[PDB]
Every structure is written in C-alpha cells, then in structure tokens.
C-alpha cells in the first residue's frame, strides 16, 4: 500500500464546500421535497441592484456569498451585460469549444439558432417560441418562476441568480389571436457534459423609442431526469453524486463569471 505525496486534509477524505451544500438543499427541495413537475433550473450572469441607490449592490464581504432570502435586503437582479462583455465571453467559449475538440477531451457541442417569442393573453401570459428559420413551434408554455437564489460576487463584474422555474406546456392559442408582445431572440448555445450554456441576444422594437438589445448568459442543467435521481439519492443518504453535479455546474458558472476584459 503506497504512501501519498500529499493528502487533501487530515481526514484524507473530500469535504463539501458550504456553498455547494446549501445550493444542493435548495435544488433537492424543489426536485424531491416539494417537487416541481416541469422544472427548469438555470443560472444567469448579471448584476444585483441596490433599490435605494440604483447601482450595484454593496456588501462588506470579500468572496462569493449566497444571500439569505428570509431577509429583505432591498435588491433586484438585472439580467444584462454590455455587448462588449457579451462578445468577450463569446470569444472565450469559442476557444473553450476549440480546445475540447482535441483527443482525450470530452468535446463541447455547439448550436446557433434564431427564434421569435410571441406572448398571448389569459384570464398570466402564454409564450409561443418559433424557429425563425423553418417557422414551426419550438415551445408553447406557461412558465412560472418558483424560487430564486442570489450570489453576490464582489471580485467579479457579474453577480449570479440561480432560478427554479415551472415551465408547463399548454395547447396553442385558438385561433388567429393577436400576440400582445413580440421580440426576436438570437441563441448561441454550448453544451458540455449536459451542462447547457447559452449566450442570448434579445431585440425588442418600440413604436416610439429606439430598439433595445439585451445581452444575457445562462447556464442550466441539461439532464433534469438524471439530476432528479441524484437528488433522491441525496435525500436518502448518498449525496455525493448530487454534490459532484452541483459542484460541476457552479464551477462552470464561476469560470464564466470571472471572464472579463
């Protein structure tokens, strides 16, 4: 039996970080405890705004910290970045793509599509997404935000918002009803180990004001079924495969969040 060169700690067994443990509870709750049926779990890069100053939130902390939701910190999250920041991240990921193409590496997958978001009315709102290319229906849902979780990151230019949503499929609006909202969406998607990473551009025109262009980055879990099964194990006692997955997700988010000019 060989003697190691070094050990990770005095127990010589891996320990879970506080952040990873907390997030894992948050995910398990909305996957297993109070299960959301058509669940979507994603993280967006952005900015925490202080509602009193309308500038980026300030906090006497020096590292990535998970804000406590049971307090009212008077804050909102803006999912947006400059075009330059959006392009800088794009160059980074293109290179991350190119490098994963090599032997010995698990390769990225790539996709570039354009879609149209159409919103309809009710007695809430309904969203119909269409491929701007061939013009079939990509999705027809009634998405509901279930819970959020904010990470304040004073060392980076971006803060994080982890979101759990309920994306319920609904039949198409009958019939030739009028959409109450219409916006275009450019989608440059990356996938690595079923972790979906999407750089989106949302253009919306106005009858009066200039056309606005919103630049976003989202990271989400591609395999909810697998993740759900991992959360069930965690709830049962074997919580290593859940921590491993959540760690992977966060590490990918952290790599991106640190990428800035």
């Amino acid at each position: 039996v060989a003697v190691p060169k070094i050990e990770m700690n005095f127990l010589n067994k891996p320990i879970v970080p506080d952040t990873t443990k907390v997030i894992s509870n948050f995910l398990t709750h909305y996957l297993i405890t109070e299960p959301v049926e058509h669940v979507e779990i994603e993280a967006k890069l952005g900015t925490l705004i202080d509602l009193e100053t309308q500038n980026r939130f300030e906090f006497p902390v020096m590292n990535e910290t998970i804000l406590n939701p049971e307090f009212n910190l008077r804050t909102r999250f803006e999912s947006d970045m400059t075009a330059s920041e959006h392009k800088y991240l794009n160059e980074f990921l293109n290179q991350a793509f190119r490098d994963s193409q090599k032997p010995g590496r698990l390769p990225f997958a790539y996709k570039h599509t354009k879609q149209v978001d159409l919103f309809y009315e009710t007695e809430d709102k309904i969203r119909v997404s269409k491929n701007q290319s061939d013009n079939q229906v990509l999705a027809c849902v009634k998405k509901r935000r279930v819970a959020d979780l904010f990470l304040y990151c004073p060392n980076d230019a971006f803060d994080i918002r982890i979101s759990i949503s309920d994306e319920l499929p609904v039949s198409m609006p009958s019939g030739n009803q009028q959409p109450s909202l219409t916006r275009l969406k450019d989608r440059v998607g990356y996938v690595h180990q079923e972790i979906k990473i999407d750089l989106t551009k949302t253009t919306q025109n106005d009858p009066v004001y200039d056309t606005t262009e919103r630049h976003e980055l989202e990271v989400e879990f591609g395999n909810i079924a697998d993740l759900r099964d991992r959360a069930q194990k965690a709830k049962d006692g074997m919580e290593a495969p859940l921590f491993r997955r959540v760690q992977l997700f966060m590490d990918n988010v952290r790599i991106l969040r640190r990428e800035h000019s």
Binding site: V22, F26, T28, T33, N68, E70, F71
Partner: peptide
Amino acid sequence: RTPAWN
C-alpha cells in the same frame, strides 16, 4: 431565520 429548505 433560515429558509425551510435549509
């Protein structure tokens, strides 16, 4: 004061 899920 901590959320139910924690």
